[PDB]
Amino acid sequence: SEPTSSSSLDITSNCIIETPLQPSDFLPKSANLFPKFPERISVDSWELWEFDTFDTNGSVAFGCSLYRDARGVEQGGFHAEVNALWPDGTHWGETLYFAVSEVVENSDGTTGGKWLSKDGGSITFHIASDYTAAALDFNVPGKVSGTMELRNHANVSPTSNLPASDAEAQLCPGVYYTFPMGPVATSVTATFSSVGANGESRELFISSGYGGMVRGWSARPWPTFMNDAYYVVAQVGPYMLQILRTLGSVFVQHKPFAVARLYLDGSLVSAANTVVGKGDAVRLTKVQPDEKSQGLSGKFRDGNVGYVLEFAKKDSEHGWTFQISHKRAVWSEPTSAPGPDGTGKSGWIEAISGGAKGENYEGHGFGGQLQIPVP
Amino acid sequence: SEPTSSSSLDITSNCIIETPLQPSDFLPKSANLFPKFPERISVDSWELWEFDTFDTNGSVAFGCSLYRDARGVEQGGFHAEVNALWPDGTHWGETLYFAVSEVVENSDGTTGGKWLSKDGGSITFHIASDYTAAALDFNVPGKVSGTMELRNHANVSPTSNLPASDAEAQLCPGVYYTFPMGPVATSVTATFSSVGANGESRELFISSGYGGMVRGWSARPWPTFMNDAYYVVAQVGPYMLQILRTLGSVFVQHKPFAVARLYLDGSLVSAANTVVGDGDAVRLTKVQPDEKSQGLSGKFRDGNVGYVLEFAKKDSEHGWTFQISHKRAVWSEPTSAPGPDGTGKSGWIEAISGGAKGENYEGHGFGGQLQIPVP
Amino acid sequence: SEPTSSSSLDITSNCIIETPLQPSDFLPKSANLFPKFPERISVDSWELWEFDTFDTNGSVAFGCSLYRDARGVEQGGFHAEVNALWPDGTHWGETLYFAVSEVVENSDGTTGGKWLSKDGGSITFHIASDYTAAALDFNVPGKVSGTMELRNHANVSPTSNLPASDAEAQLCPGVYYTFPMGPVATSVTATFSSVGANGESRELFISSGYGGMVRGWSARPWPTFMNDAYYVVAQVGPYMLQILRTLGSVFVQHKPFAVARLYLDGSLVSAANTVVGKGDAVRLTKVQPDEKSQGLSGKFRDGNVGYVLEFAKKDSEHGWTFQISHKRAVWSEPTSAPGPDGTGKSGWIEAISGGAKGENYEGHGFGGQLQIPVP
């Protein structure tokens, strides 16, 4: 509970270098929660600690992505992307900025994080030494206050499933993207200062909610390996799934990449770090509204109404397939100038069905898709 | 005095490396005229020493931008952009390539530079230890010979206004763009061997010309932080202004940046390193021909006939506003294949008017705009 | 003899770093066959050992490009492009991925290479210490087995013609592209398990064939310096020519580059490392089907039916001009989504004629062109 490792960066006091930085090495069988760029970042480098929640029916969602990268220097802070959805369709969403990001590892092996702004507002996290619990405290004046908790209850420990090699931790060479907590039950108690029309509103998820945690980092900037991405975490009957799939920019010859994990009754049954042309592999196919009647489209040039997600087992014909349809729109922000080819990012409360061949379990997910106009 | 530090690069002998280099650190309250990549240029690094002049009436102009740029090296050497405009509208413009670029700092604190080619041809500059004077000598056989001088006569020294921090010296992280001489009186006496359809011309500005000097450098190549730029140096009654404004490419999330300086009869009255986001800030708005009748358009996809330039003073409602109209075309070169979306660069002898509330000064500027086909 | 230098890379074990690596320095008057990134590759770097063959009549072709390439590693391993063409027009072509790539230099000065996969399949090469002979062995289960030989019989040695400076070995700064064996006679005996309608077929090129060898490497990825390339090796009467000619992407301001060599009965008579507006220069002009009736087009947006290739002496005004027309299609693969601006790569068995003024020699070449969808 005394700090034994400490990284503290102040984006307003010269911690950005304009040439590449190599991160600290990946640690096998660790959740690698301590920053990999501990003293300085480059204009390219990024680190992500992400915690999302939603209730079992998908009527409410609350997510928080904490970043260290240089995108927010002009706003004076590291990014904290906070998004909330109520049962009535109201959405609250902001990129919040915090001049200081401090992450410590304590002697007991717990990890603490603190995004701190000059006015004293903060978002903090605290993660158990064995990665089975995470707690966030929000204290952002005039924006959002409250708490979020994620807990793993599975039989097999988080540690048992942690990547043992760089390949198992990687989206692609040099891009690390990991789901170290696996299946989590969630709870939220939060208050938002102004929602919809200048009014305060509270939000609750009770210890019975779903969600997921993401730990990611890279020296490589996103445009150099992707121009389209999809992320979701979901519960579909007894299945717990989590996936990031990128579609490459021209700088990786438009190659797709994915990191994906599938649990069944709390046990890992599929781990994929490759796309169907190591462990397993995944295929992710966009669904168009001329193919499937149910599902919203986002507001930009990507008109898909959902996806088909297939987990293919290495040895066999036995796999798992999930139909994902966009059920409720969360966030929506452009990533280019408007127009017929304008791109953007859209968050979703997904309706998902499927499982093994013949199965038709039904559940929900929380995630989002993004394009940026990189060739 | 003899040279006390010396940077000499020669395109025949390993002057460029295929991986990134961090420049030497920015020096506070210095003009930073000595090369920031003194032993070798990197795959993407560029350094700029620029000296532009025009006469009080805008009838003649003469500009020279000296580069150490990996792009120029790939194209033949250390390069100089040289552009002249005569009262009848004839333009002379060439990119000149040199095998050797040498910059020294001397014991007395002066800075000397020499772009030199095999055949003896050369462009040299000599800058005073206190940056109040700069002299160029042109001796390029069959192209141009003569001299250029800039002399600052302000009672407040150039050093007093020099950037004291990376913030004040930067367009954006790692991109340095500075106007260390401030307001200068200029003169030029040059002969050009062939102008128009046959024929030698002299070109003269009497010490009572206007213009300005630019010192810039970065490890980051221009396409990674911009795809559209406007630069101008101008005199408008008692005002002397200098501004670069970039609009970002996808690689900086389309963020706009600016470095701008406004002097009032020799004293700095507004310093901006930020764009207004609806030191001080600047707003730069393009003007289209359906809005304003007076002004030329460039020959490429950017159809604007000028700009509105506003300096917004921190905490005040009252700033300065300048109307910029494209009066005379200088240089015009494509930067993509031609077509409806073809990009290019255009130089201008802009007609500029305005000032603070109640002011209507009128003057001229020398500048240019540029697009490149990067999303 | 025993290895005195060894570089062995394994995709299971930290073979690629996510930040730039500088290669080992170019060695003057060496074929530089040992890997320039010997301990690991970077996420940008690539290295090429390429060996191509065709018969004198242009009825059959067999080529093998061996790579260590970050893009290939991202896509499965150290890759080999293997392409074959039979007299009836049947083409066989695959990209093969290998877990291990090993190159050694032995005490006798020979260079040995081994692309090796988990199942024991391999492609090996062995190159003589004076670069006059090279032999490849293919042992790829279910794909291809056999041998390819290249031998130089010129009275002037390969060593006499090797580049002596970084400039003579370069396409552009930092991109090395070399033809160290010069003119070679070739021989192939190969068997392919499945070609056309699932049928194995043998392929024979008697020690009376033509072809060429390429050795290239760079820390700079292809999109950052090109978006269109043409490569060919050919025999036209007593002439043996070899050229790469790239057209720049926006990241090198669309500048064209070339590396080209022309031999007359075994002696180097033109070495060009520059495009027509140091040694000589080359001009490479596309020919359109509205200009010339004979010649195929590729299947993508580049509709050319051939090229005009001119070698220009600096210190005279004669040179050599060759007419290149696409005779037979070898490989054809898209490099973008399909459509009116869809790009791709096309291999060809070229018909080539020409020479100096008053010459009309006729022969054949093996090569290809490619575009990548980078502005």
Swiss-Prot record, chains A, C:
Changing residue 50 to A: Significantly decreases enzyme activity. One of its GO terms (molecular function) is isomerase activity. It holds the Pfam family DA_C. Its EC number is 5.5.1.-. The keyword Isomerase applies. InterPro entries: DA_C. Changing residue 345 to A: Significantly decreases enzyme activity. Changing residue 83 to A: Significantly decreases enzyme activity. Keywords: Isomerase. Disulfide bonds: none annotated. Changing residue 246 to A: Significantly decreases enzyme activity. Disruption phenotype: Leads to a significant decrease in the production of phomasetin. Diels-Alderase; part of the gene cluster that mediates the biosynthesis of the trans-fused decalin-containing tetramic acid phomasetin, the stereochemical opposite of the HIV-1 integrase inhibitor equisetin. The PKS module of phm1 together with the enoylreductase phm4 catalyze the formation of the polyketide unit which is then conjugated to L-serine by the condensation domain of the phm1 NRPS module. Activity of the Dieckmann cyclase domain (RED) of phm1 results in release of the Dieckmann product intermediate. This is Diels-Alderase phm7.
UniProtKB/Swiss-Prot annotation, chain B:
Coiled coil: none annotated. This is Diels-Alderase phm7. Pathway: Secondary metabolite biosynthesis. The keyword ATP-binding does not apply. Pfam families: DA_C, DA_N. Keywords: Isomerase. InterPro entries: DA_C. It comes from Pyrenochaetopsis sp. Substrate binds at residues 50, 83, 345. Residues 222-375 are annotated as: Beta-barrel motif.
